[PDB]
Scaffold this active site. Structure first.
Site, PDB file in Angstrom:
ATOM      1  N   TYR A   1       0.821  -1.208   0.000  1.00 31.55           N
ATOM      2  CA  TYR A   1       0.000   0.000   0.000  1.00 31.55           C
ATOM      3  C   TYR A   1       0.858   1.262   0.000  1.00 31.55           C
ATOM      4  CZ  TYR A   1      -4.568  -2.247   0.601  1.00 31.55           C
ATOM      5  OH  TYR A   1      -5.735  -2.952   0.370  1.00 31.55           O
TER       6      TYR A   1
ATOM      7  N   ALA B   1     -10.405  -8.095  -2.429  1.00 26.70           N
ATOM      8  CA  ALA B   1      -9.710  -8.762  -1.323  1.00 26.70           C
ATOM      9  C   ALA B   1     -10.069  -8.161   0.038  1.00 26.70           C
ATOM     10  CB  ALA B   1      -8.194  -8.723  -1.546  1.00 26.70           C
ATOM     11  N   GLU B   2     -10.115  -6.825   0.155  1.00 23.34           N
ATOM     12  CA  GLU B   2     -10.422  -6.246   1.463  1.00 23.34           C
ATOM     13  C   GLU B   2     -11.883  -6.465   1.846  1.00 23.34           C
ATOM     14  OE1 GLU B   2      -8.056  -5.564   3.294  1.00 23.34           O
ATOM     15  OE2 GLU B   2      -6.423  -4.630   2.165  1.00 23.34           O
ATOM     16  N   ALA B   3     -12.798  -6.407   0.874  1.00 22.85           N
ATOM     17  CA  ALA B   3     -14.191  -6.731   1.154  1.00 22.85           C
ATOM     18  C   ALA B   3     -14.370  -8.202   1.524  1.00 22.85           C
ATOM     19  CB  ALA B   3     -15.069  -6.375  -0.044  1.00 22.85           C
TER      20      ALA B   3
END
Ligand SMILES: [Cl-]
Ligand SMILES: [Cl-]
Ligand SMILES: [Cl-]
Ligand SMILES: [Cl-]
Ligand SMILES: [Cl-]
Ligand SMILES: [Cl-]
Lengths: 242, 6, 40, 70, 70, 70, 70, 69
Positions: free
Chosen positions: A114, A166-168
């Site tokens: 990130y 991916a984060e969801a």
């Protein structure tokens, strides 16, 4: 294996994510209500990955269907993206160990972190907007990308697609907040500081929740869960901290 | 039909 | 790797609440408050 | 000698700035201010503590204690 | 006397360097600096605290407090 | 020199207001008050510490300690 | 007056040994050393703090602050 | 100047009562006793610290920002 995430409707999107969760993870017995649980990623051999086919970006037409994401299975990290029209896998530098057959693999100089992606994108995730429009724009940026070094537009596109895939998958909170953007009124999802905090503390959360045995609350740094309902509304999938 | 949390 | 920051104790149960051990340790490491006023 | 060993059942800050703990059914007080955060931290995390003193009757003073995670 | 028993509902550092806690709906202040971090830990962890003082009216001072777990 | 590396097996507040820790099967004591809460928090979380001193035999004093992320 | 209420977004130990916190988009500093551990504990546990001061502009000083668990 | 920015790889209480932290492979020391518990807490919780100083050489420091990230 291959799974589809269908952005056609709120219902198809949620159903897509739940199918993936059911296949790659196992519910925690002590954090499970009805059909909703916190689940732990199943252990697969190192290097295992699954493909995600992006569909339904245009609700009323079968188009924008050449984007595939490659996801490392044990940790849900996005190893890169595939243009299925050119048969080209753009792979972040830190995923040399992910070998995808049948495709041309472009080993990029850019790492997936990130910190790196936000620098190249000139975009902070806290306050980042995501709408159906910006996912279409993100798709087009990724289909136009070539070479072995990420650009600003491709990095912005990856930040948005990683958030809604991916984060969801990890965080029901992000799933629920973003899915509003897929309705007919097409509002804008804005990533919150709390959303960002969740994504940067997934490992800490993954180390704590397997120990839960019905206590009144859970505390992980600045994150507080004061009942089971709070946990289930926030976290869906955690690492397997053996 | 999103249940209580989805 | 992502699971652990430091140490080896995942949680501490305090008053029917489950704490990440490192979070509890980070506010329990406070010396006796008067030492702020004594000097070197 | 080891006067009492077990979990801290309660602690108390006293008006004369001493500090009391109850361990294994017996109370002891200390005037060492540095012991105050160490004892409360032990109480919160469930450490086994050993109170050590030359006199061990309930209500007497102490200035030495061992801390075990257990 | 035992003036208030319950969890700490809020704490406050004051401009005169005293420290206030609210317990069972009543506020009490202390000038004992060693109690500041001990009371914050008690507040964070939901300890049951018992404020002890000769004056139990809200707004008055204290310098004795018992810390209990569940 | 590096005398001992490992988790703190137990700790002890001493009557002379020093503080002892047992690491890697050996005891070491320090007179530096600021270290007491720092060592106790390393102990309760299982932090690996490195005791550094000129004399490394058990029972000797130390005033340098590294807190590791192991 | 209540200048700002929220979780602490960051803190900063300054070269003059003052301590700065950012709350609800505004920065405030204090000279009270006792407040440093209390503010940092609040930051790392996500307490809701209320900065109180006669000057509420960003960059002002304070010496009164309320700590709430939520 | 911002000399370092990252998480604390180790902390170290020194024999002269100073305090050292290592960030991204570089060691910095401070003589401000107030910073000792603050830095250990940052290490325990994985706070991103920014060490600020006039000289970024391993010289001394006395200003540090503590972020939650
Ligand atoms: Cl595979
Ligand atoms: Cl990623
Ligand atoms: Cl519930
Ligand atoms: Cl921990
Ligand atoms: Cl000090
Ligand atoms: Cl401090």
């Amino acid at each position: 294996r291959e799974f589809t995430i269908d952005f056609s409707t709120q219902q198809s999107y949620v159903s897509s994510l739940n199918s993936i969760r059911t296949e790659i993870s196992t519910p925690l017995e002590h954090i499970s209500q009805g059909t909703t649980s916190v689940s732990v990623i199943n252990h697969t051999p190192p290097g295992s990955y699954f493909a995600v086919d992006i569909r339904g970006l245009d609700v009323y037409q079968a188009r924008f269907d050449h984007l595939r994401l490659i996801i490392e299975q044990n940790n849900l990290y996005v190893a890169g993206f595939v243009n299925t029209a050119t048969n080209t896998f753009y792979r972040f530098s830190d995923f040399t160990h992910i070998s995808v057959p049948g495709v041309t693999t472009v080993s990029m100089t850019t790492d997936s972190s990130y910190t790196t992606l936000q620098r190249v994108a000139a975009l902070e995730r806290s306050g980042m907007q995501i709408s159906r429009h910006s996912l279409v724009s993100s798709y087009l940026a990724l289909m136009e990308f070539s070479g072995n070094t990420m650009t600003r537009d491709a990095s912005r596109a990856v930040l948005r697609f990683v958030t809604v895939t991916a984060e969801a998958l990890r965080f029901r909170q992000i799933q629920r907040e973003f899915r509003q953007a897929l309705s007919e009124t097409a509002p804008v999802y804005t990533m919150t500081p709390g959303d960002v905090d969740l994504t940067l503390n997934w490992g800490r959360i993954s180390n704590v929740l397997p120990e839960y045995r019905g206590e009144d609350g859970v505390r992980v740094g600045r994150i507080s869960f004061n009942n089971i309902s709070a946990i289930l509304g926030t976290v869906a999938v955690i690492l397997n901290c053996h | 039909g999103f249940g209580l949390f989805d | 790797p992502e699971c652990q920051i430091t140490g080896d104790r995942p949680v501490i149960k305090i008053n029917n609440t489950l704490w990440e051990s490192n979070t509890a340790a980070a506010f329990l490491n406070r010396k006796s408050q008067f030492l702020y006023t004594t000097g070197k | 000698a080891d006067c009492a060993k077990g979990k801290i059942e309660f602690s108390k800050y006293n008006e004369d700035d001493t500090f009391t703990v109850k361990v294994d059914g017996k109370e002891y007080w200390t005037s060492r201010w540095n012991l105050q955060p160490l004892l409360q931290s032990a109480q919160l995390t469930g450490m086994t503590v050993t109170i050590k003193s030359s006199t061990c009757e309930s209500g007497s003073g102490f200035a030495e204690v061992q801390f075990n995670n257990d």
